[PDB]
Structures are given as structure tokens and as C-alpha cells.
Design a protein around this ligand. Structure first.
Ligand SMILES: *[C@@H]1O[C@H](CO)[C@@H](O[C@@H]2O[C@H](CO)[C@@H](O)[C@H](O)[C@H]2NC(C)=O)[C@H](O)[C@H]1NC(C)=O
Lengths: 46, 49
């Protein structure tokens, strides 16, 4: 008899306060923990 | 397995011989197996701008 249990839960809540570009950094957190350099520069310009 | 034989003869033849053999064997087998696996993924997303 063999039994295996797998359980992994990872949740992120980015806060990017760039009015329209604020949602980009929040949506990019899905599977991408590191922030995009180009997206970060765009948010800084915003 | 079991076997028995008996023989007796005396002259006055006269001769007599009796043999008996009985064999019996039984084999029984049984195999049962069950496998069950459950996989559930729940993802919730909420974003406000
Ligand atoms: C009946 O017994 C046999 C013993 O050889 C079992 O056969 C192997 O059992 C191991 C036990 O984990 C398995 O990893 C192998 O895949 C089995 N091989 C085969 C060819 O089945 C067998 O599982 C038992 N049960 C049955 C046949 O229902």
C-alpha cells in the first residue's frame, strides 16, 4: 500500500499605486513573482 | 496422498492381495486490488483598480 499527499498553495497580492498601468503589475503577479523591467519602467513613467 | 496394500497367502494353495490408493489435493487463490486518486485545484482571483 502506497499513499502520497501533494498540497501547495501560493498566493500573491501586488499593490501598484500610473492609473491604468497600476493593474498591469497586479495582474502580472500570476506565475511571475519577479517584476518585469519594462513594465516597471512604464509604471515609473506613469 | 494415502496408499495401503495388504497381501496374505497360506498353502493348505491360496493367495490373496488387496491394494488401495487415494489421492486428493485442492488449491485455492484469490487476488484483490484497489486504487483511487483524487486531484482538485481551486484558484480564486479578484482585482480592483
Ligand atoms: C498476485 O501476486 C503477484 C505476485 O507476483 C503480484 O504480482 C506483482 O505484485 C507486485 C507487488 O507490488 C507488483 O508491483 C507487480 O506489478 C505485480 N506483477 C504482476 C505481473 O501483476 C500481483 O500484483 C498479485 N495480484 C494480482 C495478480 O491480482
Amino acid at each position: 500500500a502506497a499513499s502520497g499527499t501533494q498540497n501547495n498553495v501560493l498566493r500573491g497580492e501586488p499593490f501598484i499605486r500610473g492609473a491604468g498601468f497600476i493593474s498591469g503589475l497586479s495582474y502580472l503577479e500570476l506565475d511571475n513573482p519577479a517584476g518585469n523591467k519594462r513594465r516597471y519602467s512604464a509604471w515609473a513613467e506613469s | 496422498k494415502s496408499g495401503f496394500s495388504f497381501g496374505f497367502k497360506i498353502p493348505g494353495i491360496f493367495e490373496l492381495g488387496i491394494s488401495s490408493q487415494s489421492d486428493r489435493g485442492k488449491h485455492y487463490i484469490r487476488r484483490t486490488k484497489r486504487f483511487s486518486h483524487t486531484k482538485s485545484v481551486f484558484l480564486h482571483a479578484r482585482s480592483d483598480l
